[PDB]
Amino acid sequence: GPKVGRLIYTAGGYFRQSLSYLEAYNPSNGSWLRLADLQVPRSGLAGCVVGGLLYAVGGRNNSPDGNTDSSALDCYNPMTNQWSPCASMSVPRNRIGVGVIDGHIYAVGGSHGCIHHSSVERYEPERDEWHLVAPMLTRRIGVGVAVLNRLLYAVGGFDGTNRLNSAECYYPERNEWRMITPMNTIRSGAGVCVLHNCIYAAGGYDGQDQLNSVERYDVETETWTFVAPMRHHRSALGITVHQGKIYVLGGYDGHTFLDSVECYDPDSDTWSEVTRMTSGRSGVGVAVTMEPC
Numbered sequence: 354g355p356k357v358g359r360l361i362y363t364a365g366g367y368f369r370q371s372l373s374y375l376e377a378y379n380p381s382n383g384s385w386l387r388l389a390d391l392q393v394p395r396s397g398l399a400g401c402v403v404g405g406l407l408y409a410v411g412g413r414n415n416s417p418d419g420n421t422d423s424s425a426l427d428c429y430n431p432m433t434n435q436w437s438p439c440a441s442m443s444v445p446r447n448r449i450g451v452g453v454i455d456g457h458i459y460a461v462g463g464s465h466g467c468i469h470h471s472s473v474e475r476y477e478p479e480r481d482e483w484h485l486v487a488p489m490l491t492r493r494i495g496v497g498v499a500v501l502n503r504l505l506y507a508v509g510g511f512d513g514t515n516r517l518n519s520a521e522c523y524y525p526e527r528n529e530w531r532m533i534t535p536m537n538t539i540r541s542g543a544g545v546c547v548l549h550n551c552i553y554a555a556g557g558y559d560g561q562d563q564l565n566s567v568e569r570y571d572v573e574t575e576t577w578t579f580v581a582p583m584r585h586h587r588s589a590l591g592i593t594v595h596q597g598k599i600y601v602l603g604g605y606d607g608h609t610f611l612d613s614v615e616c617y618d619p620d621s622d623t624w625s626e627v628t629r630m631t632s633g634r635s636g637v638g639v640a641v642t643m644e645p646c
């Protein structure tokens with residue numbers, strides 16, 4: 354089916370305060386477009402796409418005048434270059450993870466003030482409704498989430514006391530979570546995505562440093578294996594997959610809010626630096642959909 358005309362969208366983020374930017378990168382020509390701002394600036398949000406619409410989920414608006422954790426779900430239509438509110442979640446979720454299974458959005462974990470959630474809820478676009486599902490076995494904020502073979506994975510994060518190397522899997526037809534093999538590295542605020550038969554965890558903070566290492570979980574063999582490291586150490590990086598490659602966007606390296614975007618080729622096991630965002634930032638949401646009109 355059609356593959357051309359897709360862009361990598363980055364929404365929100367953090368640099369000095371939370372940001373409202375929506376910008377889209379075209380890998381086929383290197384261009385960036387600035388599109389309609391989010392209604393509310395947010396960092397620590399997640400992006401995903403269902404039915405060609407881009408959704409921005411959760412986060413927090415940090416500003417000089419305070420911090421407000423977000424329960425929002427907002428949907429951006431590339432055909433109109435407009436955002437519309439959707440039904441809000443049961444609870445604010447900053448530093449959230451999301452995944453999509455069969456047209457439904459799962460919102461996982463995140464914080465609300467000092468509350469570190471284990472709760473999980475599922476959005477039905479056809480009905481514009483959220484409903485809670487079974488909670489995780491561990492409270493997780495800064496959690497990485499990805500979907501492979503219609504199973505939902507929650508990887509790493511911070512439980513309110515410790516940063517985590519643990520990970521777990523949600524089996525929808527049983528409404529049940531089970532632990533999987535833990536990662537080799539503690540990772541809070543890693544980029545987590547799916548490519549081929551593996552769940553990749555790139556970067557993050559281990560409690561001591563921002564990481565450039567990357568490891569992948571083979572869902573058949575249940576092992577975690579390191580791949581080539583990124584050029585940059587990064588925590589709170591954006592991540593997505595497009596045409597068989599992983600793209601990582603921004604993050605914090607311990608010194609700078611990065612503007613660089615790196616791309617991982619699994620065939621050569623190498624990372625290359627492919628572009629730069631218009632400004633450095635961390636805590637963005639990222640997803641792929643059609644270019645706007």
Ligand SMILES: O=C(COc1cccc(N2CCC(C(=O)O)CC2)c1)NC1CCCCC1
Binds near residue numbers: 511
């Ligand atoms: O960009 C943001 C806000 O969005 C996110 C999004 C995803 C994860 C995180 N955290 C990173 C550190 C982790 C940890 O410390 O364990 C906990 C999770 C933050 N916040 C910035 C981060 C860089 C420093 C300045 C604030």
Ligand SMILES: [Cl-]
Binds near residue numbers: 400401402453640641
């Ligand atoms: Cl998605």
